[PDB]
Design a binder for this molecule. Structure first.
Ligand SMILES: *C(=O)N1C[C@H](NOS(=O)(=O)O)C(c2cnco2)=C[C@H]1CN
Length: 538
């Protein structure tokens, strides 16, 4: 009688929000299954089971379909998703069905559904590319009894800690290879529990605000860089994937022209437009290219020296006399055309790279694009044509070759709030079990520029003016707030509508970057931003 070792799948760790609310859970699902070879009389067994587990003709059909499409010596499911009653009836009848096994399988469950799709992700069935990745990473031995895996979001990025440590048992088997005893059991170790910075209530509020728009919202706490909300719409039900998604349902997602499978907050790549002007300003001041008193007269346009090409301001006849304060308040373009010209692409791109543009943010998700912060060498490589001075101008107002993700915008916004201190935007607060609580630790990232210069306050005061002063572009949305809001909007390329904001002005507790593709399906981005800041601050 052979003694056999058999792996035991560990329990997947639990994901909680910042208030201990479970966002991803496990449910046991029971089924009976058999290896037909090990069953003396398959047909006798199948029919006796109609009485015991309510096995149906359809069940037998699916069992036969599955029997063929399977390899020799495979345990074929006979009936799935057994009810409590049905398992009990099978249990008291088990001695009658040697070769039929009743088994419980943990499957993942997402109670809050589409509100958390992109950021939490889902686990679904392992496929061959997962196997490849596990084999290459040297992790495959630990998956001997594991058949599902995180595919995106937190479930994927933290797959290794969520999964746990496979256990095993020694079991005696007789001739025909049926289990008659368990000799020994080394139990698995459950995955670590994971505690996220997210605020579930805030996340669900934002999803409802974004309604039928293609949109992204990133809410962070600038004191920590923790992500309080990361929403991309339209979304979809992650639960669809857990038990294998229908072809009908999955093609429906792929064919949606509103591309709900895209995480727009980390993979949406847009011209950041005027939202960059606070950071360009800080750069120009720090580089000495401008001063708080630098002034030019704006006729509504700006001409490139030694050329006839003109770059227009959004305001037809100009803003008149502009310093940097008033240029931020009114989102003047002309001023920043000049600033770009005087900076040159080398300095401007170098500074914007310090703000994180063009680079990955370091967020703990694996779905992410880096965008593009253009440089001489990049245009040389990408088109094999050199950089002309006219390529620098549009970059000053966040356009040209410049593209960014909303999560990059959030990381830059926080750097301005922290006076050059760089905080990675992250979702992980801590990891638990035993536990043995391990806090997320900020990787060493040198600061930007000089903590002590008053350039940060100057740019931020301009953003305060955007929101509060009567000439500010966002006055209509924010001036009436009790707490003080500072903001900066933008419009890209109907056009995309971007908004960035933080509150309260004095000691910021929340930072928001958001965009409604093509202006959204409902309210304006400024109204939505005020609603989010109102919901948070009350
Ligand atoms: C930046 O993206 N700007 C300048 C300005 N931004 O303001 S807003 O559209 O976000 O409100 C702008 C504008 C103001 N009024 C009409 O357009 C457009 C865009 C021009 N580069």
């Amino acid at each position: 009688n052979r003694i056999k070792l058999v792996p035991i799948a560990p329990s997947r760790g639990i994901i909680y929000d910042r208030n201990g609310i479970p966002l991803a859970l496990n449910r046991t699902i029971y089924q009976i299954e058999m290896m037909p070879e090990k069953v003396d009389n398959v047909q006798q067994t199948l029919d006796a089971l109609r009485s015991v587990v309510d096995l149906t003709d359809d069940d037998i059909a699916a069992f036969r379909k599955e029997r063929a499409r399977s390899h020799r010596f495979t345990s074929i499911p006979v009936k799935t998703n057994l009810t409590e009653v049905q398992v009990a009836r099978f249990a008291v009848n088990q001695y009658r069905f040697p070769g039929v096994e009743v088994k419980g399988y943990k499957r993942r469950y997402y109670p809050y559904g589409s509100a958390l799709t992109h950021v939490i992700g889902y686990v679904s069935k392992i496929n061959d590319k997962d196997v490849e990745r596990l084999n290459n990473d040297g992790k495959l031995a630990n998956y001997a009894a594991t058949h599902d895996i995180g595919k995106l979001g937190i479930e994927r990025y933290y797959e290794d800690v969520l999964h746990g440590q496979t256990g095993y048992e020694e079991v005696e088997v007789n001739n025909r290879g049926r289990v008659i005893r368990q000799l020994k059991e080394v139990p698995p170790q459950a995955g670590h529990d994971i505690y996220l910075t997210l605020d579930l209530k805030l996340q669900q509020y934002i999803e409802t605000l974004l309604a039928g728009s293609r949109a992204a919202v990133v809410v962070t706490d600038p004191r920590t860089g923790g992500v309080l909300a990361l929403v991309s719409t339209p979304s979809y039900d992650p639960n669809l994937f857990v038990d294998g998604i229908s072809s009908k349902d999955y093609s429906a997602l792929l064919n949606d022209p509103n591309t709900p499978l895209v995480n727009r907050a980390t993979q949406g790549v847009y011209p950041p437009a005027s939202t960059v002007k606070p950071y360009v300003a800080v750069s120009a001041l720090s580089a000495g290219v401008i001063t708080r008193n630098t002034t030019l007269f704006d006729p509504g346009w700006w001409q490139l020296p030694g050329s006839e090409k003109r770059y227009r301001d959004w305001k037809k006849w100009g803003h008149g006399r502009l310093n940097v304060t008033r240029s931020l308040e009114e989102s003047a373009d002309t001023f920043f055309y000049q600033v770009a010209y005087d900076m040159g692409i080398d300095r401007l791109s170098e500074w914007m790279g310090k703000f994180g543009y063009g680079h990955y943010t370091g967020i703990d998700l694996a779905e992410e694009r880096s965008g593009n912060m253009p440089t001489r060498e990049w245009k040389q490589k990408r088109f094999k044509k050199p950089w002309y001075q006219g390529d620098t101008i549009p970059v000053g107002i966040g356009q040209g070759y410049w593209t960014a993700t909303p999560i990059q915008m959030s990381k830059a916004l926080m750097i301005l709030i922290n006076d050059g201190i760089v905080k990675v935007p992250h979702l992980l607060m801590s990891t638990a079990e035993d536990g043995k609580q391990v806090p997320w630790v900020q990787p060493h990232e040198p600061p930007v520029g000089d903590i002590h210069s008053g350039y940060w306050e100057l740019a931020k005061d301009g953003m305060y003016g955007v929101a509060n002063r009567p000439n500010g572009t966002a006055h209509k949305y924010f001036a009436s707030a009790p707490y003080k809001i500072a903001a900066k909007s933008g419009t890209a390329q109907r056009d995309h509508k971007l908004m960035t904001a933080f509150a309260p002005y004095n000691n910021p507790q929340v930072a928001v970057a958001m965009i409604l593709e093509n202006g959204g399906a409902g309210p304006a981005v400024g109204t939505l931003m005020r609603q989010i800041l109102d919901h948070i601050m009350l």
